[PDB]
Amino acid sequence: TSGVHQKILVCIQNEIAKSETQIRNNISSKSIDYGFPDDFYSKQRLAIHEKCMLYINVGGQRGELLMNQCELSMLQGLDIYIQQYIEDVDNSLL
Amino acid sequence: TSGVHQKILVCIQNEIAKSETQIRNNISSKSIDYGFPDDFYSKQRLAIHEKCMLYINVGGQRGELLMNQCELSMLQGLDIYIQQYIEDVDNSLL
Amino acid sequence: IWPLGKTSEKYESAGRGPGVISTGNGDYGGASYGCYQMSSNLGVVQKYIQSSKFKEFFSGLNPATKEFNVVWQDIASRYPQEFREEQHQFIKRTHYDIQIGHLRGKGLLFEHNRAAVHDLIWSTSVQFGGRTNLIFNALNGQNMESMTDKDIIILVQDYKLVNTERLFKSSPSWWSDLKKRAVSEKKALLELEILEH
Amino acid sequence: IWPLGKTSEKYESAGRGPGVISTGNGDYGGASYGCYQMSSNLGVVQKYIQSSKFKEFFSGLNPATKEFNVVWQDIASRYPQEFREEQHQFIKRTHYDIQIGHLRGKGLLFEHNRAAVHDLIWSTSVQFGGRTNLIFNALNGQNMESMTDKDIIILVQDYKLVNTERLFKSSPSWWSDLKKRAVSEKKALLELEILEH
C-alpha cells in the first residue's frame, strides 16, 4: 500500500467483505430452531453501518480509517456472537 | 432473590435501565459536531433487542437470563463505544 | 393429590396470586402477568390470552396498558380459582407436556411415576425449556430399569449442579444462587420421593 | 508555479486520472471517483456533482451504477483538464480552505508563505480533516515569529509522528506505514522549503 489511503481502504474493506460473507452463510444455514428473522442480517448490518459512520466526523482520511476499522470490529463481533448463539442452541435442544 | 427467576430478571433489568439512561443522556448532550441522527438511540436499542431475543430459543428461564444478560452486555458496549466516540471528536476538532 | 410442579413453585410463582401484575424496568421491560408472570415483552401473555376462556374480556386491549390491567385483575378477583388453574395449565402445555413428549420420542417413559419424578420433569422443563436435552443427557447410557425414581432424581440434579457454569456462562454473578437452587431441589425431591412410597 | 498539494499527492491521488472509477468491496463499498476517489458511500461524490459545472450531465443518474459511470468517464475523456481541475478545487474547498479559515480564527496566519507550509496545511487538512486541531496543537505556546517555515514544518511533522498511535488506536496494523508517511513528508517538505528560497 505504501501509505496510499485508498489502498488501505481496499485492504480493510476486503476483510469486511469476508466477515459479511461468513455471517450471511451462518444465518442462511437451514434449521428453524435457530429462528433468525428474514431481514436479520440486513437490519444488523445497517445498524452497524450507522454506528460506525459517526467516525467520519473525526475528520478527513483518519475518520474513514477509524470508520472502516469500526465496521470491521463490529462485524467480527457480530459473527462471533452468532457462532456462539448457534453453538448454544445446538447443545441445548433435542 | 433466593433464586426466584423473576427477582433475577428485575435485578438485570435495573442494570439495563441504568445503561439505557446513560446512553440517552450522552446522545442528548448538545453540540452538533457529534452529529447523532434523530432516531439513533431508538434504532440501535431496537437492533440490540432483536439480536439478544434469539436467546429465548435456547429454552425456558435459562433463555431469558441469557437474553437479558446479552441486552445488558450489548448496551454496556454501546455506551462505551459512544463515550469513546465523543472523547475522540472532542480532542480532534477545534 | 400432589399439585404438579409444587417442588419448584417458590422459584416460578413464589406465592403470587393470578392477578399479580408487575411493570418492567427498561425500554423493553413491558409487563408481567399472573402466578408465573407471563411477560408481554416475550409474547407469552398474549399467547395465553389467545387460548384463554377469558379471551373476549380482553378484546381490543393490549398488554402493559392501564385498561388491560384492570381487566386482568377483575378476572383474578372474580375467578381466582379458574384463572389460577388455567394459567397453570398454560404453563403445563408450553413446558411440561412438551418435555414429556420429547422424552417419549427419545425412548424415555414415565407413565407414570411418583409425583417426585414428574416434579423434576416440570421444574427442569420450565427452567431449561420444553425441548431441553438435560434430562436425556443426565441419563445417557443407562438401562431404564435398575433405575429407581431416586437414581433418576440424583442423576439429573447432579447434572444440573455441575453444569451450572457451562449453562450460565454469561451470568457468573448468579451462579451462587443457581447452584443453591439445584441442591435445594434435589433435597426437596428426595424427601418427596420417600413421602411418595 | 508549485501545484498546491503536490507533496502529498502520492497518498491522495497516487497518479490517477479524473476518469478513474473503482468499485468497492463489501455491502457498503459503493464506488469511488476521480483523482482523489470521492466515495459514493460517504456522500462525497454526490456533493461534488451538486456543485460541478458538469451537474446536468448526471441528471437522473445515481453513483455506483453503470450509466453514471459511462457519463463520468465521458467527461473525463472530453474534459481531462477541466474535470481534473474542478475535482482539485472541490477538495481544496472541503479541506484546505476550511483549515486555513479555522487557523485564521485561532490567530494563525499564512498570507502567504512558501508552497511548503501550504503543502503542509493541505496534506494535514486532507488526512485529519478541515477542522483538525493538530497544527494549532503542534504550535501550542509559540511566538509566531522566530518561527520560520522550517520550524513550523519540523514541529507539526514531529507532532504527527509521535501521535500516530494515539490518533490511530483502532488500527495498529497500519502504524508502520502511517509513520513512514509522516517521516517521508517531513523530508519532502524540507527539501521543498529550500527549493522555495
From Swiss-Prot, chains A, B:
Keywords carried by this UniProt record: Disulfide bond, Signal
Recorded phenotype for the gene knockout or disruption: Deletion mutant is susceptible to killing by V52 strain in a VgrG3-dependent manner.
GO molecular function term, any single one: identical protein binding
Disulfide bonds: C52-C70
Oligomer and partners: Homodimer; dimerization is critical for inhibitory activity. Forms a heterotetramer with VgrG3 composed of one TsiV3 homodimer and two VgrG3 molecules.
Function: Immunity protein that plays a role in preventing early activation of toxin VgrG3.
Protein known as: Antitoxin protein TsiV3
UniProtKB/Swiss-Prot annotation, chains C, D:
Catalytic residues, chain numbering: D27
UniProt note: phenotype after gene disruption: Mutants are unable to secrete TseL.
Subcellular location(s) of the protein: Secreted
UniProt-reported outcome of changing D27N: Complete loss of enzymatic activity
Source domain of life: Bacteria
Protein family (similarity comment): Belongs to the VgrG protein family.
Subunit structure: Interacts with TsiV3. Interacts with TseL.
Stated role: Part of the type VI secretion system specialized secretion system, which delivers several virulence factors in both prokaryotic and eukaryotic cells during infection. Forms the spike at the tip of the elongating tube formed by haemolysin co-regulated protein Hcp. Allows the delivery of the TseL antibacterial toxin to target cells where it exerts its toxicity. Additionally, acts directly as an effector and targets the cell wall peptidoglycan layer of prey cells for degradation via its C-terminus. Toxicity is counteracted by a cognate immunity protein TsiV3.
Full protein name: Type VI secretion system spike protein VgrG3
Organism in which the protein naturally occurs: Vibrio cholerae serotype O1 (strain ATCC 39315 / El Tor Inaba N16961)
Lineage: Bacteria, Pseudomonadati, Pseudomonadota, Gammaproteobacteria, Vibrionales
Gene: vgrG3
Part of the intact protein present: 816 to 1009 of 1017
